[PDB]
Design a protein around this ligand. Structure first.
Ligand SMILES: [Mg+2]
Ligand SMILES: [Mg+2]
Ligand SMILES: [Mg+2]
Ligand SMILES: [Mg+2]
Ligand SMILES: [Mg+2]
Ligand SMILES: [Mg+2]
Ligand SMILES: [Mg+2]
Ligand SMILES: [Mg+2]
Ligand SMILES: [Mg+2]
Ligand SMILES: [Mg+2]
Ligand SMILES: [Mg+2]
Ligand SMILES: [Mg+2]
Ligand SMILES: [Mg+2]
Ligand SMILES: [Mg+2]
Ligand SMILES: [Mg+2]
Ligand SMILES: [Mg+2]
Ligand SMILES: [Mg+2]
Ligand SMILES: [Mg+2]
Ligand SMILES: [Mg+2]
Ligand SMILES: [Mg+2]
Ligand SMILES: [Mg+2]
Ligand SMILES: [Mg+2]
Ligand SMILES: [Mg+2]
Ligand SMILES: [Mg+2]
Ligand SMILES: [Mg+2]
Ligand SMILES: [Mg+2]
Ligand SMILES: [Mg+2]
Ligand SMILES: [Mg+2]
Ligand SMILES: [Mg+2]
Ligand SMILES: [Mg+2]
Ligand SMILES: [Mg+2]
Ligand SMILES: [Mg+2]
Ligand SMILES: [Mg+2]
Ligand SMILES: [Mg+2]
Ligand SMILES: [Mg+2]
Ligand SMILES: [Mg+2]
Ligand SMILES: [Mg+2]
Ligand SMILES: [Mg+2]
Ligand SMILES: [Mg+2]
Ligand SMILES: [Mg+2]
Ligand SMILES: [Mg+2]
Ligand SMILES: [Mg+2]
Ligand SMILES: [Mg+2]
Ligand SMILES: [Mg+2]
Ligand SMILES: [Mg+2]
Ligand SMILES: [Mg+2]
Ligand SMILES: [Mg+2]
Ligand SMILES: [Mg+2]
Ligand SMILES: [Mg+2]
Ligand SMILES: [Mg+2]
Ligand SMILES: [Mg+2]
Ligand SMILES: [Mg+2]
Lengths: 138, 205, 170
RNA sequence: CACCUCGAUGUCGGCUCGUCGCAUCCUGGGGCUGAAGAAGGUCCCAAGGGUUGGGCUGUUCGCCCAUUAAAGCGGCACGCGAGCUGGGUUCAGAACGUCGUGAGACAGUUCGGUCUCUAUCCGCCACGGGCGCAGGAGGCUUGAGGGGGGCUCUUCCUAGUA
RNA sequence: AUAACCGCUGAAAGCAUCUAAGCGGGAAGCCCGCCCCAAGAUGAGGCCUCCCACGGCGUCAAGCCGGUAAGGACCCGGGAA
């Protein structure tokens, strides 16, 4: 008896609110969603997961003094090319990155790890293209 | 933010107030605005500004009589002006009064493969004493085992020149509208007959 | 012992409205909005306005007094709440006034124009003494401070913008 | 100490080219002063940029001349010899002092004394070719993200006023 | 927008306190601004303007072969490239 393995199945689309939701807590879920690990036909080597849309990405809450104290770094190949960026500035400049970045780091690494990240459309505030479905959830 | 295209003509001195004034005569010919593109269908504001007329129809089908005054498409419509909305039609040298500073963007003369020392003003080696085939060489380019590599921007020999260069805050010594001439004093990049674009200064903006 | 926290403000020709996040006072001299901790419930009784804290935690007590006072000032505010003195000493030092704007010459190679922010009103009863009128009080104390901060007292002798008070030394 | 390296990890100093740290030499901002002013002292913030030319010695260092806003301290295999130098050290010649009967010996001295055309990979400076960007073309562009730059003195007015 | 720091308002702690809630000033530094690169930014963006929707095959999935169109190379005269 060989273990069952799904065929091309269904490209699902799911909508999430973000506003008021912590961040990592939300990221956790969005990740598990990204790689259909809720689906009972989960498969590690294929990418049979939901496409996730997220709105109100800028009203992500966050505890402690993270707005000032938490910093995102970026190293250019150059000398002294290590840039330091605090939450505040990010949100005020490029929200939807703060959450995109929290999910990128929670998806596995690899060519398949990527792609799963591609199946994630984060947007500032509300609104977005509504071509597919979007069974909103919590 | 008035801008205009033109060709570096030459250099010469002027004499004013019993003082020699070294200037660079640029011809800023009439520039037929051929497109505008606003935050409507573009997201910013500028002015396609076709220059030299020419073109005995070496113009092929990509021509734009769309915007009426194409007056036989020009050789180099290239380059807008960004945040400039002209006197409606045709921009000329009239946008500049003697006494205004301007920023000239040009294409610096090319020098091809230029060595460190010229490219970068390195001191090179000694021409005598120890010497030995390293007179115009860059010397050391690193350390030892750590980092064990060369920095990302290490100044080395390579192509140098023939690039975008903008000499800033140049005085407008004079303007001669009769012939579309404009006199700035000094250091406009590129060779004569090369194309330049003259803009408002950024000291005030 | 006996804490400027749970005593009670007052009324008299002025209104009070409790929102879950703040309170609006308003009176014969304008209106003020007082942002207050979402915790801590302010109640409007008869001709008073108590403030009570949820717990007794060293952190709720701290927010208690604060809140009480923070409101009371808003009440004094809408029925005369300005003031803050400002006596300019020193020889060549004099304070004029240009319309709404206050111009004072206090020893620089120039005079300083201190145009006033909204809500604030400037008066110069005699050229060597100023007063800052307002409803806020946080704004009054600020603007009053700023104006004086233009360098001033602390020196080696009576020269510069003083408050009414503060003597000085050598 | 003796852990990788003795079927080799070239050793001082200079030159060249840097880059980083800040326990800051200058410049910016501060608190205290036994801070009248000007000028200092001392501590705090601050690494953006700057941080001179000579005499002596192989020297590093240091002393000295003339300046300066200042003449900063360190790390990078006491950064850098498949980049240069080769004065020093550190083979073979020779000499002095010294030691040894001697051959010879000296972190003692002296004069001399072979520094090896070809870059495979990584890295770096440049410049292309290919394919991709799901119709194919010619123009004009947005800027995510990078990089460059960032120094300072004197005099004058204020005012010979506080 | 901040550092040291200077303050406003202000409790805990009646007084007082620049701070614990708040706010204001405040560095040659930080983020923008200037200059240059830059859509392989596979997240490959945009705008304008051109040619068009062939012939057989692939009977269906994406394709295969020719001519072609707008254009583009080849070749040649040259160039402060
Ligand atoms: Mg050339
Ligand atoms: Mg050069
Ligand atoms: Mg030179
Ligand atoms: Mg040099
Ligand atoms: Mg030299
Ligand atoms: Mg030379
Ligand atoms: Mg030699
Ligand atoms: Mg030679
Ligand atoms: Mg080496
Ligand atoms: Mg051993
Ligand atoms: Mg042992
Ligand atoms: Mg070996
Ligand atoms: Mg070897
Ligand atoms: Mg110390
Ligand atoms: Mg200093
Ligand atoms: Mg002094
Ligand atoms: Mg001091
Ligand atoms: Mg420090
Ligand atoms: Mg010598
Ligand atoms: Mg030294
Ligand atoms: Mg010595
Ligand atoms: Mg010296
Ligand atoms: Mg160094
Ligand atoms: Mg050592
Ligand atoms: Mg070494
Ligand atoms: Mg060598
Ligand atoms: Mg050496
Ligand atoms: Mg030798
Ligand atoms: Mg020799
Ligand atoms: Mg003997
Ligand atoms: Mg020996
Ligand atoms: Mg010798
Ligand atoms: Mg000889
Ligand atoms: Mg020797
Ligand atoms: Mg060699
Ligand atoms: Mg390798
Ligand atoms: Mg290419
Ligand atoms: Mg695509
Ligand atoms: Mg950018
Ligand atoms: Mg930089
Ligand atoms: Mg930058
Ligand atoms: Mg730099
Ligand atoms: Mg005198
Ligand atoms: Mg005076
Ligand atoms: Mg500010
Ligand atoms: Mg107080
Ligand atoms: Mg502050
Ligand atoms: Mg501020
Ligand atoms: Mg500056
Ligand atoms: Mg560009
Ligand atoms: Mg495109
Ligand atoms: Mg356009």
């Amino acid at each position: 008896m060989k273990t069952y393995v799904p065929k091309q199945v269904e490209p699902r689309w799911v909508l999430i609110d973000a506003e008021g939701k912590t961040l990592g807590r939300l990221a956790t879920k969005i990740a598990t969603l990204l790689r259909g690990k809720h689906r009972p036909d989960w498969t590690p080597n294929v990418a049979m997961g939901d496409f996730v849309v997220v709105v109100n990405a800028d009203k992500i809450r966050v505890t402690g003094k993270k707005l000032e104290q938490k910093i995102y770094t970026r190293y250019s190949g150059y000398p002294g090319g290590l840039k330091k960026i605090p939450l505040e500035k990010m949100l005020a400049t490029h929200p939807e990155r703060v959450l995109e970045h929290a999910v990128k780091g929670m998806l596995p690494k690899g060519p398949l790890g990527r792609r799963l990240f591609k199946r994630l459309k984060v947007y500032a505030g509300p609104d977005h293209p509504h071509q597919a479905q979007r069974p909103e959830k919590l | 933010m008035k801008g205009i295209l033109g060709v570096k003509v030459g250099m010469t001195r002027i004499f004013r107030d019993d003082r020699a004034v070294p200037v660079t005569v640029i011809l800023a010919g009439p520039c037929p605005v051929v497109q505008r593109r606003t935050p409507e269908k573009d997201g910013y504001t500028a002015v396609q500004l076709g220059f030299l007329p020419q073109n005995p129809k070496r113009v092929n089908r990509p021509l734009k009589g769309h915007f009426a005054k194409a007056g036989v498409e020009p050789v180099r419509i290239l380059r807008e002006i960004r945040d400039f909305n002209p006197e409606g039609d045709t921009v000329t040298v009239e946008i500049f009064k003697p006494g205004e500073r301007v920023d000239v963007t040009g294409t610096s003369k090319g020098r091809g493969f230029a060595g460190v020392m010229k490219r970068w003003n390195f001191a090179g080696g000694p021409d005598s004493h120890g010497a030995h085939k390293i007179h115009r060489h860059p010397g050391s380019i690193g350390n030892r085992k750590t980092p064990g590599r060369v920095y990302k921007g290490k100044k080395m020999a390579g192509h140098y020149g023939a690039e975008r260069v903008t000499v800033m805050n140049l005085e407008v010594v004079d303007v001669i509208p009769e012939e579309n001439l404009l006199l700035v004093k000094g250091a406009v990049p590129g060779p004569n007959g090369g194309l330049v674009i003259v803009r408002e200064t950024k000291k005030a903006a | 012992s006996r804490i400027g926290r749970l005593p009670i403000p007052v009324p008299k020709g002025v209104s009070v409205e409790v929102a879950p996040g703040r309170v609006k006072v308003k009176g014969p001299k304008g209106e003020l909005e007082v942002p207050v901790s979402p915790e801590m419930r302010v109640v409007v009784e008869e001709g008073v306005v108590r403030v009570e804290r949820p717990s007794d935690e060293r952190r709720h007590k701290s927010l208690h007094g604060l809140t009480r006072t923070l409101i009371a000032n808003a009440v004094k505010g809408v029925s005369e709440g300005y003031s803050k003195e400002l006596l300019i000493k020193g020889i060549g030092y004099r304070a004029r006034l240009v319309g709404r704007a206050l111009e004072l010459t206090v020893g620089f190679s120039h005079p300083v124009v201190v145009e006033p922010p909204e809500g604030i009103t400037f008066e110069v009863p005699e050229p060597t003494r100023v007063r800052v009128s307002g409803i806020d009080k946080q704004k009054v104390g600020q603007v009053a401070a700023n104006i004086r901060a233009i360098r001033k007292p602390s020196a080696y002798h009576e020269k510069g913008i003083y408050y009414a008070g503060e003597p000085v030394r050598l």
